[PDB]
Design a protein around this ligand. Structure first.
Ligand code: GNP
Ligand code: MG
Lengths: 173, 169
């Protein structure tokens, strides 16, 4: 009689194509990684229940392709957002500001947003030094973390941070 | 001028070697497949004039603890600096624009390096990361000859890097 919960949060994945959104998703939900995964067709979502400061939080995580699309069904009802860029490709990070723009035009304006932060496993190819993305995120009010969906680093931590924060600001109101 | 056509043909020794490494993957340094590449590619490619730093770098590369970060312009910098600078390569010891910095442990200080050193080191590192993908079950959609030719490609990049043929962006 599980899959029984208290609160339900919908988090969406956004960022350029090829940054690792779908593998972040599969790593969190199914603990699977796909080295050869292709670009996502349509939109998809998966669910995982975790526990947060004693109150049951079940996360319904949304994912879609990075690159006109019917953009407002995906954002509609999103209480959280993961803005994802590739640490090894600076251009993916440069489009973060624009992913942010499209994040609050066609979606909620007190949506919880975390900057990611992916493919941290590629250390010799690092394009974005942590200080610059952390500067940008801190200055834009966004929380920030660096993940590797490949070696699982900070995936759980990231999702649990955005979840704890959404929980906390659904505890206030 | 006459026409030369670029061709590609698998050396059967290297190919059987690789197929028999593919059949039972290991990162063990003494396996023939890796041993050869160590002797012909890796060791000469990470050979630099300051060589305790160079060997530290090699160990960092096979331990996957090495990190390469781009360093941008900055008029001011806290200094505990041997570690080189924007002026000079910490590895080869000469005066060149260093657009990259290197860290061994993370858990370590930074060392500035020429784009050339960056190219060699990243060549080796790319080889190691691909071979590690293979050793684990991460590569499932690539045919055996594809895998082989990717290994050949990486060894190409390392071979060119050896002789001073490198790319800079
Ligand atoms: N080294 C490394 N590669 C990763 C990591 N995460 C994903 N990748 C790789 O990067 C590529 C793109 O991954 P994918 O998850 O499909 O990205 P995406 O954001 O879903 N793309 P799309 O927006 O088109 O659906 C794949 O080759 C995948 O294996 C990571 O943490 N490290
Ligand atoms: Mg995808």
């Amino acid at each position: 009689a599980s899959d029984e919960y208290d609160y339900l949060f919908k988090v969406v994945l956004i960022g350029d194509s090829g940054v690792g959104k779908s593998n972040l998703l599969s790593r969190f939900t199914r603990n699977e990684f796909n080295l050869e995964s292709k670009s996502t067709i349509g939109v998809e979502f998966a669910t995982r229940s975790i526990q947060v400061d004693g109150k049951t939080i079940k996360a319904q995580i949304w994912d879609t392709a990075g690159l006109r699309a019917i953009t407002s069904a995906y954002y509609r009802g999103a209480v959280g957002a993961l803005l994802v860029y590739d640490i090894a490709k600076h251009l993916t990070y440069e489009n973060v500001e624009r992913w942010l723009k499209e994040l609050r035009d066609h979606a909620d304006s007190n949506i919880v947003i975390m900057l990611v932060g992916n493919k941290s496993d590629l250390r010799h190819l690092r394009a974005v030094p942590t200080d610059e993305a952390r500067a940008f995120a801190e200055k834009n009010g966004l929380s920030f973390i660096e993940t590797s969906a490949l070696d699982s680093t900070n995936v759980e931590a990231a999702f649990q941070t955005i979840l704890t924060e959404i929980y906390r600001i659904v505890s206030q109101k | 001028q006459p026409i030369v056509k670029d061709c590609k043909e698998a050396d059967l020794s290297l190919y059987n070697e690789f197929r028999l490494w593919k059949d039972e993957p290991t990162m063990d340094r003494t396996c023939p497949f890796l041993d050869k590449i160590y002797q012909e590619d890796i060791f000469p490619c990470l050979t630099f004039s300051k060589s305790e730093l160079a060997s530290a770098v090699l160990e960092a590369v096979e331990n996957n603890t090495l990190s390469i970060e781009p360093v941008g312009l900055q008029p001011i910098r806290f200094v505990k600096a041997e570690c080189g600078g924007p002026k000079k390569c910490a590895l080869t010891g000469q005066s060149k624009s260093c657009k990259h910095r290197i860290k061994l442990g993370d858990s370590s200080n930074y060392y500035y390096i020429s784009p050339f050193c960056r190219y060699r080191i990243t060549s080796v590192c790319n080889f190691f990361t691909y071979i590690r993908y293979i050793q684990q079950g991460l590569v499932k959609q690539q045919d055996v000859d594809q895998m082989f030719w990717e290994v050949m490609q990486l060894r190409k990049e390392m071979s060119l890097a050896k002789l001073g043929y490198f790319k800079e962006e």
